[PDB]
Amino acid sequence: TKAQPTEVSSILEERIKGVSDEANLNETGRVLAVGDGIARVFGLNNIQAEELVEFSSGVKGMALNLEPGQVGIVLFGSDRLVKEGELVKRTGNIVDVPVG
Amino acid sequence: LLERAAKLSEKEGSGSLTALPVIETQGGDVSAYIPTNVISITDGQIFLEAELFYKGIRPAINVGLSVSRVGSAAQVKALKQVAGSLKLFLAQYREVAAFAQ
Amino acid sequence: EVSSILEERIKGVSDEANLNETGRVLAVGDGIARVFGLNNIQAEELVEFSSGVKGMALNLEPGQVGIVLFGSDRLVKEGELVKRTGNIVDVPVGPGLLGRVVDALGNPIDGKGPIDAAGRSRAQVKAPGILPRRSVHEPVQTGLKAVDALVPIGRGQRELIIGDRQTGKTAVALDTILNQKRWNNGSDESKKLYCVYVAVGQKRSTVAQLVQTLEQHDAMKYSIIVAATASEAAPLQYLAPFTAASIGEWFRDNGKHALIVYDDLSKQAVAYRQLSLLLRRPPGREAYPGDVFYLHSRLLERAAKLSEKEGSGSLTALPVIETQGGDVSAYIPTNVISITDGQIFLEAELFYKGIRPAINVGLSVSRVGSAAQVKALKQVAGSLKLFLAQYREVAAFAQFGSDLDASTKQTLVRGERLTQLLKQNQYSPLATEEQVPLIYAGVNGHLDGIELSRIGEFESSFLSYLKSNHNELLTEIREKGELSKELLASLKSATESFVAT
Amino acid sequence: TPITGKVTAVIGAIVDVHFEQSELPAILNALEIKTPQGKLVLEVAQHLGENTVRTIAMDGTEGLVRGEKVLDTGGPISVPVGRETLGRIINVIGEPIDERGPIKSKLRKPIHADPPSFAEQSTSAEILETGIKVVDLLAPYARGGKIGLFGGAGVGKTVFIQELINNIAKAHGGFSVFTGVGERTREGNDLYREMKETGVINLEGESKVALVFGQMNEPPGARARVALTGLTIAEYFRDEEGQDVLLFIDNIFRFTQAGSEVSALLGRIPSAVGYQPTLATDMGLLQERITTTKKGSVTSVQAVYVPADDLTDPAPATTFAHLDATTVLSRGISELGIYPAVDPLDSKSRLLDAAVVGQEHYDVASKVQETLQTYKSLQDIIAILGMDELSEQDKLTVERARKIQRFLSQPFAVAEVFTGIPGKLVRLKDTVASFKAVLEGKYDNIPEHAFYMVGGIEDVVAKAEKLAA
């Protein structure tokens, strides 16, 4: 009918079994699907705009797009070891560099 | 829209609704999708020119790019006779003055 | 009579077996459809609609499998079942396609009865290896003195004829086919060509004139005409090069040579566009499909010369791309140029100029150089290339009205005579024996003593002169295919005896 | 069929219906939706699955209530053909527009046809003359030929076509069809008038013409199937009677154009340049249902309206493949005081050869092209410099080319009033002599206005006297 990222099988089977968000689907995230180096992560409803997030593949990302369900991450490193179901910790510090 | 404009029959009083739709071209070029769509439906142009306009005819007519091709069944005998082939003649002057300079 | 034909057909019809697949039609119309089901379906396989249509299948989905109809879509209804034939698309190949027209699928449409089948083949066979290939050395001509002379036409190479629609695009190809009479007659089959002409996007009447032309000039007896007219389905236009290539390949296997004309690939592309967008999958550049390159490149690398552990065959390819109001940088035109190894560019303006067959020598290139011109013909056209390339710079300066020296005007005077020599009449076969004398004259400066208007008068007369007197000169050329010391002298004397007129 | 349904949607002229019965429908069927317009006749073009069909709508889409009852006719629409269609004008569904009431027939046939085969093909190589000098010499037509015309309209297309009718259908006299796709209504009346006056349509007898008129006012769908309707009539003539016919169309670009509008709606994704992806299949069928068969042959004259007067667009370009001969007409040359405005360097025929319309014809025609082309190549030079700053050999060509250019005209016999010169008609035989003559230098030594608005060589001489006095 229509496409949503709450009609994904992992999301639906956890809600039906009465599992909640639990700061894992609210702050942190988990990858739903990543392709074209554009990971889309489920959770992170508390997040700032273009905030730095750290994956379990070693790769870091930015959030150009904050959409309702997903937060559409763009990955800065290679895709080689990046995959589905990763925890994507919220670094909680917007992208920054040393000044001095 | 355009073909609603019509000289009707004498059953219908012999009525009219003359269309005169005015198209604003980009940069004096008569071949673009909108000018050409309007041109197929109608007959003739009353193509107007900016150079002639500045030069004392307000408003100006360009008769080398203006014809009316169903125009001379609407006209009276006076303005047929007096005007006969005068339309050619100022397009003979066009040929001449191209190679005069 | 009629009673008997119909009763045989009833005997010949009906009684289907237990089915092992199904799926239900849903979407349907445009020659195109989509079915729900089908788990044994192969990609490219043929599925039999219960209306009498057959449709190959090009997209499979775990939803709805897209089987593109061949047959009329008006027969097809929804909710019908379809039955997998269980074989990917194939054509019968055999020596019974000689002097007959066959369509997309390989059945005759000229009503000349059932074909003779010695094998079946498949439309996808693809290119042979690097080890079962050998290099091309194999002379061949097109019966246009100009083309032969300027660019190295071979047997086993691919040369792309490009230029505007309906400038006798077809006509250029027809001269070559007429001239392919000369080798076919010759006893040896290691010379013979059984030419296959593929016509895509053309009206039935174009094809019907062309077969009359072929028979009249007594050239229809090795030719095959494959057709897919513009009304006939978008799959069937797509399948027309690939099944022509399988017919061509059978000669190759046997150790015989043949030549494939693909007129026009541009219209094959247009079909595939219609197909790809009605399976609603993304195209490439300018609405033409994303996998359009895959189609031209795979096809084209199958017309290949074979080594001596194989047949030692070679299918030769001539692509034809008609550029719609020019444009050589348009997506289908760009792709094909890259794939081909030469161009025989045909220029539209030069046609009105009276240079018919029309060619432009800079837009026509050979990357690897000459290696397939007849050796005799190489010797005479030796400086022909340098002259004409120079004439083009000099002429452009020359007509301005400026002042010129005698040195610049030797180029103009020399070029004008050379260009006029190139002119020939379409649908006129030519031989090496009668293109060697003419280029000699031109290069060695005996056409400057002869006025520009009467260069055409001269040609026909010079060759006739030789039939009566120096008939020995012509025979040496036919027999040895090269010019030695003696042949240069003989010919230098032959030009001199008749320079007049 | 007793298949009934209700109207789910009514999006523009592309109504969608949903059948409440499980009896399954077929492609190219017709449905009637009972309307306060009497009835509306529609044509299934797609089945989208789940018994939701998608239908093309011919007449108006004001009044169609959603969830309104249908009954399914069960097949294609059949028009009425015969010799009792002669002197009648018929609408797409068949209706009289000239109101001599219901159209009689012996045979009523489906609109669609299945294009002839390779087996049914026959050939031609005949010579047909219009009598027009430029057409005959450079682009000669034939009997059963398919001709193509190009460049915009409201510039002399109607007149040009009217003139082609005025010559060819009175040099033939047999059966003829006029089919007008997206015709301009005020002009359509001038054809009706013109024909009756010129003795063509005769309604106190039967005509030597039958007619189809579809106006450009009408919804896209009707405009698409004016053409197919017309073809059914021509096939009747071709086949049943056994006689060769004529066909004129002004303009056939409309077939293309209307199909482009409906395409977006239908489900189809349209190609670049906004043209339908189905142009090829529609073109293919039309141009092969006008074709030289074993029976008759329909010799046709086709008028294409070109947008922005560009051939680089795919709709005009894909047509050239199916035409034996073209005579490309460009608006600029029409402006210059030259009629016919046909370009002489942008004309072609597959019947202009050195033994098809004879050798003399070829040599003359060849020379004109060579002369004019050189002149075209030098147009920059001639204007930036002068015309004695040219090289001498060229000076002869340039001067020669200028005479041919003014010569090309031939006042029309149907627009004699509007040009302001009487209509001139000359033979193919008279034309070969006249062009030959100019090329020989016989009456080359007389003003450029002498060759200006006149037909053949004879008229030129008569006018030198007129200027001289």
Added chain:
Amino acid sequence: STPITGKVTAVIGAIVDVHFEQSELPAILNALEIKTPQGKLVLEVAQHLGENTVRTIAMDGTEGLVRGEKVLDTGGPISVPVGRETLGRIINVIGEPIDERGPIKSKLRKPIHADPPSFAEQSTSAEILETGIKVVDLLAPYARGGKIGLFGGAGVGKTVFIQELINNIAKAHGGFSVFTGVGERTREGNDLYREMKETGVINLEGESKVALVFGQMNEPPGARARVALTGLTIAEYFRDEEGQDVLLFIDNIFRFTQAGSEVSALLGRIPSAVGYQPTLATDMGLLQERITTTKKGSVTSVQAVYVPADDLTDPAPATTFAHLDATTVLSRGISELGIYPAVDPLDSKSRLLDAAVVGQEHYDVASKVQETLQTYKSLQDIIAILGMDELSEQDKLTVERARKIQRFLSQPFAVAEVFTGIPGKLVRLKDTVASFKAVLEGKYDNIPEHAFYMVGGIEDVVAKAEKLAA
């Protein structure tokens, strides 16, 4: 990740989607192998689409594919073979020979996804290549460690050019070359194979001095693409472990580009300007960046490029112009006039043109050559329009020096004993600089133009004078 079983769901040509069982999927950039009645079909994983649905690019011919046909996972990426024994041997997308030598003799294997070397490893190029081609040596010097670029349009003698460089330099050096062909014809592959076995460069006894990677256009657009990657990895083994400089070649690199554009569209991605990929920049970069001078060894590419219609407002050639140090243009025109090579040297710019790299003397001679020729090209319009007006003795002398130089750019080649039949000559770097110096000074402004025709050094001009005298 690990070997698992998935079933095909959708076949959309090259594009193949799989639906692996729940919680089990391969990672991105892996190789799946699927049993097929035509070799072993290799599928390159390029996306995740959620619920364990991957979408792949084909590496081997597609035909006869059933939805439901088992797909194994290797657990890792497409792994090629590398070694000093794969030299002469032919390798393609799935590392199999197509001239039927059967399974490759492998010392080591490696992945084709090798992440680029970092800035710490960098070294500054100071080693100077010689090509022994005068017009190239003088007007756009190459340096070994470089990223040379053979810009040209269609049919301009690029293959013939590459054929001369490989025939001469590979044997000369004690290094390696690996010749990689991306999406090019089976006529060319068979010529490139035949001519280079003959000359002694590729030889079956002994270790070949140039390896081959033939990837050809009959194969998939995906399969064609990662041929280039395949060649690179062999050059990388050479660079690193064997510790040897490489003299790389790739041919034609637009074929590489074109392939990525096509597959961008099929994957569903939105195309950029003038029908080019949005990922155009990074893909060129990945290959170019790997080819670089490290304290491991160098890698020196010489890359043919196809430039549609001698046009460079087209974005795909223009982006590529950045990456390449010492450009040359093989103009179509130069070839036709009978001048070999087809290089036009007023459109070639090099960054390797200094004045203490190649010495002051080299730079300065070429500068005068640039000006001398270009004033002559500038006077062509002037004769064209004006006639014999607005000239001088100075112009006449420049016109004459330039036409002597113009016909002094031609150097016959051994691998064109098949095109014109004129055999090779080799001209040293120092030798070209001298011979060009002599002409400029006007000591050889007394020797006719055609007496510089098909010469090498200075000795050759004097000798070609005697022929024309005699």
Added chain:
Amino acid sequence: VRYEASLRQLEQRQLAKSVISRVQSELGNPKFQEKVLQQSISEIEQLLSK
């Protein structure tokens, strides 16, 4: 010659309409019941051949 070739066509559509005319009589009869039954027993033999 033209009339003979029409006459062959006319034979082919005329005998076509007899096949239809004969089908209507079969779909009238309780052969419409009795031959559906023959199909029915044939399908038992078919599934048994698996």
Added chain:
Amino acid sequence: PPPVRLFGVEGTYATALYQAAAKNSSIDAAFQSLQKVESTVKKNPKLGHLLLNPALSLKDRNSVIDAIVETHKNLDGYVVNLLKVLSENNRLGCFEKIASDFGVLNDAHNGLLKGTVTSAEPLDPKSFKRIEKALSASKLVGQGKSLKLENVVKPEIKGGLIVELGDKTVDLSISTKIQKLNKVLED
């Protein structure tokens, strides 16, 4: 987990609902209680069939779920969590779809298939029973995929029958044989 994915449209739900009940260890009950409740929603007097297209609030919808779970107190707590998901995503136009989809998954786990043997007009009861015997003898019914023969009447069957189950059909209809006979005799 799914007992293989079946149905793309609204089978994504049916899959979730099923995988959640596999760990409970009662799918059959779930299906049964949902089935009875699915019917009693449909046969609601006013607003059964007449409200299936949402035009209210997500919150008004949530209260539509709330009033439904009063109609029966046996529905299981997992199908109660399914409702929440559906109320929140605001879908009720393909509500019965998930229920049927769930039935297809569910009854494949039972080892029942629901076949149809469409004909021109009803066949005999001995014919039916002979066809079920025949299918069981064959491998078309392998067991665990056992049809329940449902005769349906189709006016486009001009005699004969077509037998149906899984993605397997045996077609000895008359409609197909006449369509083909006709075409060749006009070809």
